[PDB]
Amino acid sequence: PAPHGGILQDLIARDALKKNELLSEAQSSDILVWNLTPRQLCDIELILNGGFSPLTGFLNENDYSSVVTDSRLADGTLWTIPITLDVDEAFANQIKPDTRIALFQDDEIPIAILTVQDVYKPNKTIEAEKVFRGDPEHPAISYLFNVAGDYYVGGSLEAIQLPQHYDYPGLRKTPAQLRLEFQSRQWDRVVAFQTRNPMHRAHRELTVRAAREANAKVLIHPVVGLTKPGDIDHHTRVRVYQEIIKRYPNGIAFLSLLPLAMRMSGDREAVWHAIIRKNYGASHFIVGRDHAGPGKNSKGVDFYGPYDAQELVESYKHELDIEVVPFRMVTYLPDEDRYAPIDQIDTTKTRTLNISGTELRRRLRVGGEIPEWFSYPEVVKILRESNPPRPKQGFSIVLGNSLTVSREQLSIALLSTFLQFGGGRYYKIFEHNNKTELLSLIQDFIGSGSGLIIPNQWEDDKDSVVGKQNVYLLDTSSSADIQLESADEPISHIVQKVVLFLEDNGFFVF
């Protein structure tokens, strides 16, 4: 289909002969420089390559507010997610309209030149409520208030080069390249499948059914840009996709990585996704249950209805110009060994089965066996390998402030004790001295599977530098993960308490 807006805005192609000139202006000591934030790098790449056609820069206030209140650009073009360049007051104050800024990656690689159209201070509450539905726990809203700059800079781009990536060089196909890919193959019907999770059996069936319904080839188009916090890293997912792609009949599917930065914005994002895939050459786009939805909030309520995206996408149907293949909860059928849309069964006459991602983590974290029917073995293997069960996980024991015994001796006692268990885990008494350069390493070790014995707490002003993950507090306090009887409880007693606690939580298995 025609790219959204009618013209693929591949600015790398457009500005090619200006490459050298733009590069010189980018490195000239007079120009103002902004180092792109991670999410911005994702966005900037989708704007420069045509993925966000018709966009050609970051939204000015006029287009931005139109998108917030109208799900459309100022000119009426259907567009649901605001793409802006968020900066801080300091930087915002050094720019005026007509100014030209150099956009860098890693304060070293010049990406593009942005020509300023305006500098405004968005009402984050409105954006949060009109675009992401208001819940403070919604991922997009948390980013907007805790990570995003309080100033937006609308303006047009002139491309120097897409953001730098040293991984999967062959796979991050640009809209132009994908289209060429489909052509060399004479693929004129392609149904794209969005995703941010590893694909399991349900999804393989889901995508093949779509392939069959639409009479089209399959495009696994996963996000490797930025997804829901706590998601499986894209490296692991890529390995999973590459593995599962082999279970498709020869020549039916194509894999391409999309450096998109999701907002986990349910229905609106679904619309945005469809526009994006259309630019990339797809003729069909799947929209299953709770598409781009972040699940439930701490209170158990849904951020979006499991089918809000489908309804919204349906309502813009006549102007999306890319056919949407909707799917209802695809689930497992024990008695018949096969999956099927829940909309075409049940009646109690048929018994289903469904292993939610929740419980999926649970078995991964507990070395539990994951059903042959649920996911392919090679896939589960890759997953366990990246997310090991507790007996292979790292952790830390922090000797609480209330601790009266010799921290030096209690430390050694724990070390020598853990050491006798064996099991390949590396242990260390780790003294941080409140130096963030040391604190920031704590999660590295835990990530590496090591067990750390930390003799002292770190000041509360530093608590943010340390990832709470697998970090237990040994103390008399009620807020201690491992509660002691008294601050001066004898070492061997404290030791047994720590060991049995770790054993209870699966870190040790005898």
Ligand X SMILES: Nc1ncnc2c1ncn2[C@@H]1O[C@H](COP(=O)(O)OS(=O)(=O)O)[C@@H](O)[C@H]1O
Ligand Y SMILES: [O-][Cl+2]([O-])[O-]
Contact present, 400 and 457 (Cβ < 8 Å): yes
Q: Which residues on neighbouring strands pair with residue 151, listed in sequence order?
A: 87
Binding-site residue positions: 194-197, 288-292, 330
Token digits of residue 316: 């813009």
- Is-catalytic flag, 197? yes
Which position among 137, 346, 431, 488 is part of the footprint of Ca ion (CB under 5 A)? 488
Token digits of residue 355: 């292993």
Q: How far apart are CA 271 and CA 5, in angstroms?
A: 15
Q: How far apart are CA 426 and CA 263, in angstroms?
A: 38
Q: How far is CA 36 from CA 104, 105, 111, 125, 293, in A?
A: 6, 6, 9, 24, 27
- Is-catalytic flag, 123? no
Q: Which residues on neighbouring strands pair with residue 191, listed in sequence order?
A: 218, 284
Which position among 68, 162, 192, 312 is part of the footprint of Mg ion (CB under 5 A)? 162
Contact present, 457 and 432 (Cβ < 8 Å): no
Where does this chain touch Mg ion (CB under 5 A) — which range of 104-112, 163-171, 304-312, 449-457? Answer: 163-171
Q: How far apart are CA 405 and CA 35, in angstroms?
A: 49
- Is-catalytic flag, 338? no
Q: Which of 115, 197, 236, 456 is catalytic?
A: 197
Q: Which of 174, 195, 279, 470 is catalytic?
A: 195
Tell me how far apart the terminal alpha carbons of the chain are, to the nearest angstrom. Answer: 60
Least distance from Mg ion to the Cβ atom of residue 162, Å: 4
Q: Which of 196, 263, 277, 363 is catalytic?
A: 196
Query: How far out from the chain centre does Cα 309 lie?
Result: 19
Note the residues at the interface with its own copies (CB under 8 A): 167-170, 177, 180-181, 184-186, 250-251, 254
Q: At what angle do helices 266-279 and 308-315 cross, to 10 degrees?
A: 50
Binding-site residue positions for sulfate: 194, 196, 292
Per-residue DSSP letters for 399-440?
A: E-TT--S-HHHHHHHHHHHHHHH-SS--EEE---TT-HHHHT
Taking CB within 5 to 8 Å according to partner kind, which of its own copies, Mg ion, ligand X, none is near residue 28? none
Q: How far is CA 298 from CA 12, 134, 210, in A?
A: 43, 14, 34
Q: How far apart are CA 483 and CA 486, in angstroms?
A: 9
Least distance from Mg ion to the Cβ atom of residue 49, Å: 8
Taking CB within 5 to 8 Å according to partner kind, which of ligand X, Mg ion, Na ion, none is near residue 312? none
Least distance from Na ion to the Cβ atom of residue 128, Å: 8
Least distance from its own copies to the Cβ atom of residue 115, Å: 29
Phi, psi values for residue 314, rounded to 5°:
-65, -45
Taking CB within 5 to 8 Å according to partner kind, which of ligand Y, Mg ion, its own copies, none is near residue 189? none
Least distance from Ca ion to the Cβ atom of residue 34, Å: 17
Which among 10, 40, 4, 45 is positioned nearest to 259, based on CA atoms? 45
Comparing CB distances to ligand X, the nearer of 288 and 394 is 288
Taking CB within 5 to 8 Å according to partner kind, which of Mg ion, Na ion, ligand Y, none is near residue 360? ligand Y
190: Cα within 13 Å, side-chain hemisphere: 28
Comparing CB distances to Na ion, the nearer of 1 and 391 is 1
Taking CB within 5 to 8 Å according to partner kind, which of ligand X, Ca ion, Na ion, none is near residue 150? Ca ion
Taking CB within 5 to 8 Å according to partner kind, which of Na ion, ligand X, Ca ion, none is near residue 197? ligand X
Least distance from ligand X to the Cβ atom of residue 138, Å: 13
Note the residues at the interface with Na ion (CB under 5 A): 1-2, 107, 305, 308, 321, 323, 504
Note the residues at the interface with ligand Y (CB under 6 A): 197-198, 232, 357, 360
Residues numbered 172 to 211 that lie near ligand X (CB under 6 A) are 194-197, 202-203, 206
Query: Any idea which residues carry the catalytic annotation?
Result: 195-197
**Which residues in this chain contact Mg ion in the complex, by CB under 5 A?**
162-163, 165
**Which residues in this chain contact Ca ion in the complex, by CB under 5 A?**
150, 302, 486, 488
